[PDB]
Design a protein around this ligand. Structure first.
Ligand SMILES: NC(=O)C1=CN([C@@H]2O[C@H](COP(=O)(O)OP(=O)(O)OC[C@H]3O[C@@H](n4cnc5c(N)ncnc54)[C@H](O)[C@@H]3O)[C@@H](O)[C@H]2O)C=CC1
Ligand SMILES: Cc1cc2nc3c(=O)[nH]c(=O)nc-3n(C[C@H](O)[C@H](O)[C@H](O)COP(=O)(O)O)c2cc1C
Ligand code: SF4
Ligand code: FES
Lengths: 213, 430, 85
């Protein structure tokens, strides 16, 4: 939760980090999505790829990304401190992101936050002693009709109750992976009591095509 | 036509909004997507821009700028630099969860929108800046973009029209500010998502210094449906200067929090009672409504009775349309706590570039945190009004404006609840 | 830049030595604290010649006009792109 680096024994420029060769293929594929001379545009996906390989960013992933893109290290440090995904401390393997903005707070995300705190045995920001779970409190994740919801490393688990998030944490502690969706009866974003729209089949291609096309 | 709403299932642009059909190419071809795209593209940029300016399509991102006039700013001769369409898919707004549905469920509509829009503006390719939290949506859209390339719909010889148009997806990294168009451009350029100053508008200097149009996913994806159905058809929905259909996100305290498509000037009471199953407790349980996502001022029950859900009637109702994301709040709501948590959002998502937002939004959050407990005296409400009026209009982008507006709406409609909070604090602590 | 509007007339600095009692800056120059303010240059020149003071003239140096372009910070092909903001 700080925005400076202090060299620990486990975080320094002599901490080992390097990409796998398939990650070098992926980095070349990323850099090819950007114009020539703007190789610096690929700081964000390559540093995100470094987080996907390592789980978190020491200051050797930042320096490696700055070395391969020939940018200054400071310009990667600005990116890694600007954005809330680049984890600069080693998080747990399941990173529970509870949304607590106003549309999730109106549908009682606080009960879910208290339920995760009493189910894992931690509070906001901390990490469980098995290093599997880290619980932090994030802003709007963009699933507002499916409020309340959480995000666990990639996946939205929506329409939750306290019992639903207890059940999902239980089947995470069993080593499996749940289904990333709502936990009420609906599927994505329809009204829960039934389809108020889109009941009919679509018209097919060519419906209402004006003259001259 | 004076009555609006009751949009029928045949006039829905976003058929398969709900994921009930195949989002892939075999499903999207069965619904009108990628039909006669070659004949759209061969008719030049001028016919496309004429149909979009005919269609009355305004900005579906939330600001509501006229989309065809905006896209015509790229209709200009080449001067060595390439041109780019950039599709704003960040969607960080509380209440707003509709472009997630467009990316996840109608992706080929977005890719055809990228192709038709980039043809309208001479754009070389399309960078779709998706949110980094939308990982499944990003892989979903890359699957559909692979389906578009392997069918030859995009890329080399796009749909057999002799146009070359790539479509890229660039993933974000968790910043609400990178939905503003210039901060998004800086987030593409491998930098901090700090907004640029206008002018240069992105049609002059945009992504990588090139001419650029940044448009929302909704106002990009509805463009081939406009260019197929015609302009005046889409213009025949909603009031004048409010032409068309709109995806509404009725969130909050309703029985059925849902995303639905409806005509542009539908009544708010009719929308909540007809698609969301009403407020939890009926219409007599409503307290306030944040009509279009977090950056718009709330309005109480006496205004939400007769109000229309478009740009002009909500500006006359001293708020804005915005993203058309309806946040419904009942009588069981600590409303000052809700607006203070919303200001807490707008300081945790604020890039710290210019002075008034960087300092004043934190200062408004501290004042609102004392207002929740009541730890203040009633001069500070007017003080907070003046702080919000000093933030409003003095910033680089409208996050300062979009942060000052919930404070001004809360004060303007619920000054007495703040005053009675503070006076019961003053009696019980002294 | 409001202190760069007027012509000034100071003199050559003389010896400032250490007071043996207190370590203060003692001087024997009466014209040490004398700075004269003039609107134009020929006013100061005529006032220096009128009092028999030998003088040198250093011209008013205006900061030359720059070309400023905020759009140059985000160019396509020039070196005047900024790596951050
Ligand atoms: N969709 C979402 O997730 C969110 C949407 N918003 C909306 O964003 C709105 C603020 O929009 P902004 O991007 O700050 O600005 P907006 O006032 O300027 O302008 C809208 C668009 O028109 C263009 N434009 C405006 N004036 C122009 C001119 N004179 N010449 C050329 N182009 C011009 C801008 O480049 C921009 O793309 C808020 O009112 C809110 O409703 C805010 C937050 C989230
Ligand atoms: C702080 C801020 C955040 C914004 N976030 C988004 C966003 O997430 N998605 C979006 O489409 N527009 C967003 N906008 C609006 C854009 O600046 C821009 O108006 C829009 O993306 C494209 O214009 P359009 O309404 O014609 O589509 C945001 C604006 C501001 C000031
Ligand atoms: S007003 Fe806030 S959001 Fe905008 S450039 Fe300044 S710090 Fe950034
Ligand atoms: S408010 Fe929690 S997802 Fe938008």
């Amino acid at each position: 939760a700080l925005f400076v680096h202090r060299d620990t024994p486990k975080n320094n420029p002599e901490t080992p980090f390097d990409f796998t060769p398939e990650n070098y293929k992926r980095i070349e594929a990323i850099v090819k999505n950007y114009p020539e001379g703007h190789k610096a545009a690929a700081v964000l996906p390559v540093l995100d790829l470094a987080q996907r390989q390592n789980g978190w960013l020491p200051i050797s992933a930042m320096n490696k990304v700055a070395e391969i893109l020939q940018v200054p290290p400071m310009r990667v440090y600005e990116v890694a401190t600007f954005y809330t995904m680049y984890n600069r401390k080693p998080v747990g393997k399941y990173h529970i992101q509870v949304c607590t903005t106003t549309p999730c707070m109106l549908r009682n995300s606080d009960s879910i936050l208290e339920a995760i705190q009493k189910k894992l045995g931690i509070k906001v920001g901390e990490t469980t002693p098995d290093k599997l779970f880290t619980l932090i409190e994030v802003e709007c994740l963009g699933a507002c009709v499916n409020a309340p919801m959480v995000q666990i490393n990639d996946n939205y688990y929506e329409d939750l109750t306290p019992k639903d998030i207890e059940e999902i944490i239980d089947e995470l502690k069993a080593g499996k992976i749940p289904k990333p969706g709502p936990r009420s009866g609906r599927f994505s974003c329809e009204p829960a009591g039934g389809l108020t729209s889109l009941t009919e089949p679509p018209k097919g291609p060519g419906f209402g095509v004006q003259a001259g096309l | 036509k004076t009555s609006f709403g009751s949009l029928k299932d045949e006039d829905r642009i976003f058929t398969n909004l709900y994921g009930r059909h195949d989002w892939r190419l075999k499903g999207a071809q069965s619904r009108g997507d990628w039909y006669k795209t070659k004949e759209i593209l061969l008719k030049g940029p001028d016919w496309i821009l004429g149909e979009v300016k005919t269609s009355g399509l305004r900005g579906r991102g939330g600001a509501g700028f006229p989309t065809g006039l905006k896209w015509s700013f790229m209709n200009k001769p080449s001067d060595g630099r390439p041109k780019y369409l950039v599709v704003n898919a960040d969607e960080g707004e509380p209440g707003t969860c509709k472009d997630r549905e467009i990316i996840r469920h109608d992706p080929h509509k977005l890719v055809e929108g990228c192709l038709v829009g980039g043809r309208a503006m001479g754009a070389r390719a399309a960078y779709i800046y998706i949110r980094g939290e939308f990982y499944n949506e990003a892989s979903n859209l890359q699957v559909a973009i692979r389906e578009a390339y392997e069918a030859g719909l995009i890329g080399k010889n796009a749909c057999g029209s002799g146009y070359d148009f790539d479509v890229f997806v660039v993933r974000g990294a968790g910043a609400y500010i990178c939905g503003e168009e210039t901060a998004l451009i800086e987030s593409i350029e491998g930098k901090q998502g700090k907004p640029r100053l206008k002018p240069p508008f992105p049609a002059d200097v945009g992504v990588f210094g090139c001419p650029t149009t940044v448009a929302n996913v909704e106002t990009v994806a509805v463009s081939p449906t406009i260019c197929r159905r015609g302009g005046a058809w889409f213009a025949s929905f909603g009031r004048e200067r409010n032409s068309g259909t709109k995806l509404f996100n009725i969130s909050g305290h309703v029985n059925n929090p849902c995303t639905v498509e409806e005509e542009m000037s539908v009544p708010l009471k009719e929308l909540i009672e007809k698609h969301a199953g009403g407020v939890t407790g009926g219409w007599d349980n409503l307290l306030a409504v944040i009509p279009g996502g977090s950056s718009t001022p709330l309005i109480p029950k006496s205004v939400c009775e007769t109000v229309l859900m478009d740009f002009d009637a909500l500006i006359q109702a001293q708020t804005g349309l915005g993203t058309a994301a309806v946040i419904v709040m009942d009588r069981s709501t600590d409303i000052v706590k809700a607006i203070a948590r919303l200001i807490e959002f707008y300081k945790h998502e604020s890039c710290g570039q210019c002075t008034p937002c960087r300092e004043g939004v934190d200062w408004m959050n501290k004042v609102m945190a004392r207002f929740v407990r009541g730890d203040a005296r009633p001069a500070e409400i007017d003080s907070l009004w003046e702080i919000s009026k000093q933030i409003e209009g003095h910033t680089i982008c409208a996050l300062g404006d979009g942060a000052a507006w919930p404070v001004q709406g809360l004060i303007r409609h619920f000054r007495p609840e703040l005053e009675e909070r503070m006076q019961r604090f003053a009696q019980q602590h002294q | 830049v409001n202190n760069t509007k007027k012509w000034k007339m100071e003199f050559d600095t003389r010896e400032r030595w250490e007071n043996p009692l207190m370590g203060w800056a003692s001087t024997a120059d009466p014209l040490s604290n004398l700075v004269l303010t003039f609107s134009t240059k020929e006013d100061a020149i005529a006032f220096a010649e009128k009092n028999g003071w030998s003088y040198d003239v250093e011209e008013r140096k205006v900061p030359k006009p720059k070309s400023k372009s905020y759009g140059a910070n985000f160019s396509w092909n020039k070196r005047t792109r900024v790596s951050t903001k």
